[PDB]
Amino acid sequence: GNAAAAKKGSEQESVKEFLAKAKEDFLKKWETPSQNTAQLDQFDRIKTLGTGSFGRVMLVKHKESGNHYAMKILDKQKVVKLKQIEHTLNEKRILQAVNFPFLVKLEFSFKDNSNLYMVMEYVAGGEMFSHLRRIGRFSEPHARFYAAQIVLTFEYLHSLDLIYRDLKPENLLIDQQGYIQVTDFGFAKRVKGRTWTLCGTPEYLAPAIILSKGYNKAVDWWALGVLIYEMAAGYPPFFADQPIQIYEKIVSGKVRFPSHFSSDLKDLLRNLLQVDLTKRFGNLKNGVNDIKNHKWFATTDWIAIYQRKVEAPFIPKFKGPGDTSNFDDYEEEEIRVSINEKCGKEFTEF
């Protein structure tokens, strides 16, 4: 009624101011990035928490404090070979400048002759991926709880002219309170307007990215559509054995929903998985509000989510500091450091 209208109308003026102060803070750091804030020997390398097509993330304990952290290690030479120089510079420069409840915090960063290091706060709950695959699928309220956090995060990121570009269960972690911690800013980019790089993860690529067309922040909203679908169904809306097969499905414009999906969920998803980006939710005149006001999110207290006052639907087990039981095991490898500095000029600003 007239009460909700006032509540919604007022809250928007508030988030408006919030975002305003947030941009000031961000800009300050974006213009003058922190650099060389620690060194390799101040940490003891414990175990590999995960690997990607780019780096290795290892659990580590800070010697002069005992505190644990998640350290991402990138081989400078490999970065160059995979043509990820600018992306890597974007990754660190952006990650060190952002500040939001659901974004993993970058504690320190530095480099040596061979590698680039990004020391993050260790999120011990494990990837959303493992829990999702183990459980099968999340109930709509469970999926909604996480979705709401992604919506707020993208509102934040997008307001700073940042595009995320790699939303997936694998890049989302659960903290001790059962809340989300977005990691992997490898494809994050500060850009006003269209961009063209082919990047992301197959199952989550928007049609524009696949068709080598320029694209904008709307790809993140499409990715959200895929995330919610996968979280609620247990499998992706577009899957196959080869990426190209997945791509043909993505651009086709055809999506089928499980019989157990609610009417509200299907409607929201048809709007997010909208091939026509001019008709896609999050990219219309009212932007992100079209999503926040959508029926599927009717029971979502957005301000409460931001304050982390909502009881999480699931809280991972934590047997104390250094506990990596929520992560798969990986084959280890010595962290080699050449006596010769590699790709110095390329990574000067890191």
């Binding site: 990607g52 097509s53 990820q84 990047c199 992301g200 197959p202 499998y235 196959a240 798969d328």
Partner: peptide, 19 residues
């Protein structure tokens, strides 16, 4: 079922990014 077809496919494990 769709879920059975997914579970039997080659991409049910952790997915790495492409570039």
């Amino acid at each position: 079922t769709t879920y059975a077809d997914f579970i039997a496919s080659g991409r049910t494990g952790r997915r790495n990014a492409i570039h």
